[PDB]
């Protein structure tokens, strides 16, 4: 095993636990000449990284067959890679890396989201006095009195809002 | 009306930047999506990017996980790094590379 010192202004084009014999380059530095070439035969590894950075990206690796691009929310089933063997199990960007030879994405999500009383208000716009009357309707009778102070007063209110004529959101 | 908490959840939400979760969401941080329920001002933005953290190496400090490797949330990342969050592991750049060649 022969350590090759490789100074960080060089490139290096292999995974960790890759396949390399006597012909193979191994870190193809930036600038030609000199850089190394493969020693002999057998496996690689890299040693002390700068940064060793954790994502909550998950790991899906691959022979072949890259279909999913780099930066698409996939969601939990679609296919990134391996024709149909390899399948997401969480949105986000999918980032590609040949190099390792796998495909990860990070989880991440389109949450809609807000602050202030914008926040409040669109949903109150949202806030659909009609279905929750029967839900409430239903869920001050058969629940027991855990649930029925909360449905006894929440129901009183919407139904205040709905024989007035001024919506919720006028709040 | 709103069914949030009639006191604390309204005040937390409605002066200060602390996220509301009104429609949509799926992902979760144990619990699946909140349908009106609220979450801080650090599970939203760090939702987008849960334990993404670059942990700088120190040069002549290897490691203690090879590349692509399951971490768990306080495991030593390196011998001279502490991680803060779980995940997988990934590395850098490359300054030494020894492996059996024949």
């Known amino acids: 095993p022969k350590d090759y010192r490789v100074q960080p202004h060089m490139n290096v084009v292999v995974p960790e636990g890759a396949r390399v014999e006597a012909g193979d380059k191994i870190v193809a530095a930036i600038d030609p000449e000199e850089e190394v070439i493969a020693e002999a035969e057998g496996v690689v590894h890299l040693h002390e990284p700068a940064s060793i950075l954790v994502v909550k990206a998950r790991v899906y690796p691959f022979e072949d067959d890259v279909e999913v691009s780099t930066g698409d929310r996939v969601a939990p089933g679609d296919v990134l890679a391996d024709g149909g063997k390899v399948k997401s199990d969480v949105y986000g960007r999918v980032e590609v890396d040949l190099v390792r030879n796998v495909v990860r994405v990070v989880e991440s999500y389109d949450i809609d989201a807000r602050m202030g009383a914008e926040a409040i208000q669109q949903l109150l716009k949202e806030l659909d006095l009609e279905a929750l009357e029967k839900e409430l309707l239903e869920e001050m009778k058969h629940p027991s009195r855990a649930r029925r102070a909360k449905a006894r007063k929440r129901l009183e209110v919407v139904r205040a809002f709905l024989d007035s004529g001024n919506r919720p959101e006028w709040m | ?102």
Do not use: M
């Open chain 2, 1 to 102: 009306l709103l069914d949030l908490s009639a006191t604390e959840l309204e005040q937390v939400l409605y002066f200060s930047k602390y996220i509301v979760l009104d429609p949509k969401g799926a992902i979760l941080n144990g619990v699946p999506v909140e349908k009106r329920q609220l979450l801080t001002d650090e599970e939203y933005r760090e939702l987008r990017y849960g334990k993404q953290e670059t942990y700088p190496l120190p040069p002549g400090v290897d490691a203690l996980v090879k590349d692509g490797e399951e971490v768990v949330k306080g495991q030593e990342l390196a011998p001279g790094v502490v991680s803060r969050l779980d995940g997988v592991a990934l590395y850098r750049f490359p300054r030494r590379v020894r492996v059996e060649y024949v």
